[model samples]
Target: ISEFGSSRAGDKPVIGDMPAQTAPPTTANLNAWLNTFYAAEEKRKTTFPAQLPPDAQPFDLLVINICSLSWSDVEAAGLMSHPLWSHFDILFKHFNSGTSYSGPAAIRLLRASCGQPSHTRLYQPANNECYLFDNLAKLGFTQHLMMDHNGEFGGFLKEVRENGGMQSELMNQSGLPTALLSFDGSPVYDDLAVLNRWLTGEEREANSRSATFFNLLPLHDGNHFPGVSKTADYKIRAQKLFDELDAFFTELEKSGRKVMVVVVPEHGGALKGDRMQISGLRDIPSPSITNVPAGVKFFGMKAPHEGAPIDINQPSSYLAISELVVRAVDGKLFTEDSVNWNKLTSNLPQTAPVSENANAVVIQYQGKPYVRLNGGDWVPYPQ
Candidate 1:
């Protein structure tokens, strides 16, 4: 096994992509680079459908957002090693999630693509920002938010949540209708149960294919915790998730529709040795990844890895993964660079230390990132 254990892929260590802390950017002082994003006027044109053609019909996108499971814990349990994951190009290397806890992870996942990268102290998010979901709603997709647990996390660690620390703002910011929010306490399934539970008729027909942001109970799934469950437990749970996805994608493919299904970990774990307790937020964090559990499906996308690995030589971001989801249903894939559309890291990370990066919101405006650490004054990211 590689340093990352059974989940390890390729030659690089799982944490290889993380930059040395010696110097990085911050919320202010952006003269560091000549092309900072904050310095440029926000583009007026619609880059929303980055790769989708106008005549294409949006397919279906399902995001299985796992809660605070870490790469180490996954390695320990061999969570991604099952035959079920064969459908996916199980990436091993990705990077640090924007924030290592669920509250910020959920918020960032919901809004990473809106505008240029920005940050705040903890979870004190600015309300003025637009969300990818908002754009999807405007673009005619029936937006759905299904949580296996209370979607808002029962206001846990409320400070780091979006919309200036309001937990309920998850619905508002994502533009999910109140009708769907009513299903907040329902069960979640990969078969699209929550989505099936809510959408019907014209709304359903209006979205012959739509996008659903399905958030499952990752951290608190009781008997399903990998560390505490059987070594086989990892295979069991993964099979449930992947098996669940296999059928869903198969359904989409059978219907002559393509689906972009990504299973990304919201954050990594702080699990202690042996006992396997979840210490997310209560302790320092480690590198986490957002993986593409399903292998290539329509839209002419190719499978780079049986379990696809990310292009580690370049910077990767959760927003890059989200970009694919946005265009998954009706869009074609883009091999665009971060600055352009062709170089995105839609394929999961492999051969390195990461899966999906959560802190993808790192900005480059006016040439470099301008950020402020903690609540301090404006300064360039630590160089």
Candidate 2:
């Protein structure tokens, strides 16, 4: 998923330099800070959709792509307290009763609201917004609050490290456990092994409960643009993220649900040499169109324009999804002869344009075309 920010810049800070070895803030300074923070938070709060209806069907999956984050935005979103801790008063108010929510649902709903873009210019944390580290922190904090009641921080940390840290730990510990019983209980030697199996099964189920996937790639660093140098750190980061996603999907498959991940950039950044012509139009070289570096059977493509919308029911879109799913289900990528190229092409909207490879499709609708490659582009038709 790719989301881009608008051109509007955030507000500039009033105070200039950092205080040199300052003491605790004075009451006057504290008050000023509080006032400023509240005002900024109020502005950030305005972005939320006003009053979601009580009877609305909760989305099975929700992906919030917050392009920017400010301190006020974080506070206004009420991210500090867990639902069990601070929202107890309103817990029953919004429970299984159409108007209420269970603890888990409340947490999910709260997560949907965090990290909204804000109009503040303060230097936010590096992991702020939709970045992976920030998300990890949010998940870790929530896990600690929800699970560490009896001074089990040490145990929690141990579990995290042993289970390969945040994402892995989250997968292992999410939701309730499932048990298998046998009538002829002949010497159940290692209860720990049985418990481990039960936990593993539960974790698999939890990971597959939702089919949504989130992906993000860095555009430019302080020094250079991504995808420029083959050995660039940004490229390495992308590769690592892709690997993590593959592992996630592997875990998901164990639980019976199939997951499809689509990846694309909001916009490609200009290289150092092309920085001078930022505003001016210049032909930029496109990134190589390929699957994830870790041999995940997914197809990738690059857009010529800056994240222009494309129609999904086009040939190129079909090809991309077909490649990914086929490779995912079977071990190898499908050949042209194996793929129902003619049927796939015929299934596309007749008005769509034909292109080479049919690996990418652009569809113009409502004066704006949206591009989606393969898989989901093939919507079921009414019989």
Candidate 3:
């Protein structure tokens, strides 16, 4: 079995075993790399233009915070071929959500609405420029909030207001049909109906613009449709959610509104269990739970009819999204006749995947993923 590197210098053949494969980088090396990565990330910022030009085209912005979906979850559900994904003008193939829990994930996304901050910096106060919506508000976009559920669990509403700066009143959900039952037995309203209702409300002035943030939880773990004895699996629920989203896009297109919709999931549902965790448990913020799918849909802009959306394969986080919004606002995204997709997305900030939830952290180093749990020593993920 020692056939590698055989040599016959004399009468007998001299054979030796193959050299051992290069071992993974030590935890010390990983720690050093992580430290440098964070240090460099601190310098990156997404600065919005002071104000829109007098001739700039005006449009509304909608940030849809989808829950319980990720690239892994989408693949596991066998939904990679869904047409809803192809409806976007831009799609991020390797986007990291940066956290696993709802509250932390929301705050992290909000804090990063303007810049990417290290996990530790999330707890500290951020400058005004870091507030993405505040920047939009300064640009004449009124902030509005909506959610399919009551947002009572886990202090999600409070956190989004107190920390995330979404202090606007949540749109009422009355008279909407019940779509499902949440994990805690709360009624989940129909997503399409709620969105349609919002859009159907009184029209705005000729130059008015609004930035609405909506959260949908139909695919959240443990949620079940009403009148059915058994809860549908994650795959079915995901497909349904995608279908509904596609319908909503159609509605937007028909309404003749020039709205830019950004769809991003907070984290995955962790449907598949791993060595260190069980199914639906998201305590570790593993890649499967954080490498989510994010995309942008421009209602007036046409998606390519024959090909998939322009894909950004680099590791990215909320910072890329913030930068995209800045580019859209400053450039001719809505005013130009022909869009240059490549130039628009070139040189975007590439953030390394580092997801955290409270004390647990997961980081990718030298292409291998690692995890540190409860402030303990680093180890290979799933150990």
Identify the candidate with maximal TM-score.
3
Clashes of 3: 0
Provide the lDDT at 244 for model 3: 86
What is the full ranking by lDDT, best candidate first? Answer: 3, 1, 2
On residues 1-383, what C-alpha lDDT tens digit does candidate 2 reach at each position?
A: 12774444685544321122132344344334333433432232112222333432211121211111111212333432322112110011101100001111112122221221111211132122312222323322122111101113224223322221223232222332211111121111122232233335434554322222221212122212222333234333333333433444344335432222333222222221223233211122111111011111112111111122122332121123222222222212122225432332243211111111123222222222223233124211111
TM-score of 3: 0.89
The per-residue C-alpha lDDT of model 2 at residue 122 equals 14
- Cα displacement (angstroms), candidate 3, residue 77, comes to 1.3
lDDT of 3 by residue, 1-383 (tens): 26685555575632211112134667666666656666666656788877888877777788899888888888878999999998887899989998888877777777665445655677677787787888889987888899999899888898888878878988988899998998878988988898888777614444457778888888888788786667768898888788888999999889777788899899998877678888888888998889999998777554322367788888888888888888876435765667777888788877778888778778876677898777667888953
Q: Once superposed on the true structure, which residue ranges of model 1 sit more than 4 Å away at CA?
A: 1-46, 49-54, 89-92, 114-130, 156-209, 218-239, 272-282, 288-315, 325-383
lDDT pick, better of 1 and 3: 3
Estimate the TM-score of every prediction: 0.56, 0.24, 0.89
How close is each model in CA RMSD to the real structure? Answer: 11.9, 23.6, 9.6
Q: Which structure is stronger by lDDT: 2 or 3?
A: 3
